[PDB]
Write a protein that binds this ligand. Structure first.
Ligand SMILES: O=C(O)[C@H]1O[C@@H](O[C@H]2[C@H](O)[C@H](O)[C@H](O[C@H]3[C@H](O)[C@H](O)[C@H](O)O[C@@H]3C(=O)O)O[C@@H]2C(=O)O)[C@@H](O)[C@@H](O)[C@@H]1O
Length: 211
């Protein structure tokens, strides 16, 4: 294992992100990536690997740029990644987001993996929030993205002129108006953020770029 900053292709993303992990694991978000590696964030096989176990715990990059959905020029996150077979007991985790930040407070978009869902096994999901309310007042659009691929796939999230799109391996599976989401604190996230599962979840990035 080596520091993902050793693999040059990850430098553009790492220059404009910081790494978040539990307060029991690091005191503060990591902002300087040269020479940095840990059990939750390391490179093997020239990839950038995130690993975290336990409900509500993350190892995730928080992109530093904050923006509004009204943006004139496309805001885009494109990943080439693998979700290796999850361990027995891992039920639900998130691997990319459009996070709502300090004003939005909830994520506009989560891309997640689930052992089991009803609307399905070994299934990926896009959740687009229709408001930022908590509890029972929360409203959502749930879009089924299909079975977890067994190897690499391309995930491409774009927001432009109030429209959110997701393309998985070139297929546009999400295309929604988001103009209701007025908050100006949105940013991209990528990595692993466990919702339900004691064991470790692993998310393997082969490439990640924002624009
Ligand atoms: O998979 C389902 O269809 C599932 O939806 C469940 O509620 C979701 C809810 O829609 C929302 O996506 C929520 O997302 C949370 C996220 O889990 C995380 O905690 C983050 O901090 O905040 C997100 C947010 O507030 O948007 O996750 C819920 C979930 O537990 O999966 C239920 O409605 C369930 O009945 C249904 O099967």
């Amino acid at each position: 294992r080596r520091p993902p900053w050793d693999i040059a292709r990850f430098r553009p993303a790492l220059r404009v992100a910081k790494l978040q992990a539990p307060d029991s694991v690091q005191r503060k978000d990591v902002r300087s990536f040269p020479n940095f590696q840990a059990d939750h964030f390391y490179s093997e096989n020239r990839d950038m690997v995130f690993v975290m176990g336990g409900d509500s715990q993350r190892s995730e990059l928080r992109f530093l740029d904050e923006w509004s959905v009204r943006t004139s020029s496309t805001r885009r996150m494109v990943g080439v990644l693998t979700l290796p077979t999850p361990l027995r007991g891992m039920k639900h985790f998130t691997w990319m987001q459009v996070a709502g930040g300090s004003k939005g407070k909830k994520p506009l978009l989560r891309l997640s993996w689930h052992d089991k869902r009803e609307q399905l096994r070994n299934t990926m999901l896009a959740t687009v929030r229709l408001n930022n309310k908590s509890g029972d007042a929360g409203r959502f659009k749930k879009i089924v993205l299909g079975t977890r691929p067994s190897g690499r796939f391309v995930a491409d999230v774009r927001v432009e002129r109030s429209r959110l799109t997701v393309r998985l391996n070139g297929r546009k599976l999400v295309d929604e108006d988001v103009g209701y989401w007025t908050y100006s604190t949105n940013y991209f996230k990528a990595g692993v953020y466990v919702q339900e599962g004691s064991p470790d979840a692993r998310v393997v990035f082969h490439g990640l770029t924002v624009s």
